[PDB]
Design a protein around this ligand. Structure first.
Ligand SMILES: C[C@H]1CC[C@H](NC(=O)Cn2ccnc2)CC1
Ligand SMILES: C[C@H]1CC[C@H](NC(=O)Cn2ccnc2)CC1
Length: 279
């Protein structure tokens, strides 16, 4: 399948070269997979989600996304126009309030929730969790991310936005999950992207168009935007049978475009997520 005039990040993850605008992907499109977006919520009523999104848990007085961040990330995973995996099922877990903030205890609870709740959902092709959040190092937060991964969920986490080594941030620094840095449309590391040996992969993160609250759309930047590209890619590849939740991060690294990014610090992987799709 081909989507013309796609957001640059979708085109990039289906290309061996920057500078193209069509997204190419197998029409299975992540059908039969599920992606949990652990964030500020998801505006599931957005036309872009086509009934495939639903809120399943909140830790606040409402499950509504009053911020937009979670809706944007969910759109990059799985919205019809802006998403990698256009037929996946999206599940929202609101661990961040409408200011984008959340206590580590709440974030940990949300991760343990997903590890259990996937047993209440029909996801025959596999389960992914996208975590576009983090803060300073916490062994408890890292342990929760490791538990979620060990339970059979492909965990993709944002590296962070401080132009610093991600070893000092959580859950970015947990080795067993998939830690995602950000790139721009000219194949440069995004100016704010964290780096380091803990990174597994880069995805598009600068100027990413996706869904927003109020039935709208906008372009924003962050490792938060790169992470759902990788989460959606994992769901897509799992539906194709090419990998599993336990192996998808390694598979994405194995099949990535290699050596194409600039301003990658020595010791950080030079790997850009790529779907290897051939019509
Ligand atoms: C909107 C732009 C359209 C053109 C794109 N071409 C490239 O990236 C290729 N390139 C890089 C340096 N010199 C040539 C990039 C985005
Ligand atoms: C409202 C949004 C919620 C998530 C926000 N923060 C991060 O991702 C920060 N981070 C990642 C790793 N270490 C720190 C970005 C804004």
């Amino acid at each position: 399948a081909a989507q013309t005039n796609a957001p640059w990040g979708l085109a990039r993850i289906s290309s061996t070269s920057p500078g193209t605008s069509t997204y190419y992907y197998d029409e299975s499109a992540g059908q039969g997979s599920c992606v949990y977006v652990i964030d500020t919520g998801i505006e599931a009523s957005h036309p872009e989600f086509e009934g495939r999104a639903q809120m399943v848990k909140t830790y606040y007085y409402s499950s509504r996304d009053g911020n937009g961040h979670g809706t944007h990330c969910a759109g990059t995973v799985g919205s019809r126009t802006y998403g990698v995996a256009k037929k996946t099922q999206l599940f929202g877990v609101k661990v961040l309030d409408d200011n984008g903030s959340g206590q580590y205890s709440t974030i940990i609870a949300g991760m343990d929730f997903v590890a259990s709740d996937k047993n209440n959902r029909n996801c025959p092709k596999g389960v992914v969790a996208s975590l576009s959040l983090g803060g300073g190092y916490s062994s408890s937060v890292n342990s929760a991310a490791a538990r979620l991964q060990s339970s059979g969920v492909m965990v993709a986490v944002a590296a962070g936005n401080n132009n610093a080594d991600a070893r000092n941030y959580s859950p970015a620094s947990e080795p067993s999950v998939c830690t995602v840095g950000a790139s721009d449309r000219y194949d440069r590391r995004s100016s704010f992207s964290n780096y380091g040996s803990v990174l597994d992969i880069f995805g598009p993160g600068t100027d990413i168009l996706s869904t927003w609250i109020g039935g709208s759309t906008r372009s924003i930047s962050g490792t938060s935007m790169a992470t759902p590209h990788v989460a959606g890619l994992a769901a897509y590849l799992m539906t194709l049978g090419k990998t599993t939740a336990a192996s998808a991060c390694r598979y994405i690294a194995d099949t990535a475009n290699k050596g194409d990014l600039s301003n990658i610090p020595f010791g950080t992987v030079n790997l850009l997520a790529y779907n290897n799709y051939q019509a």
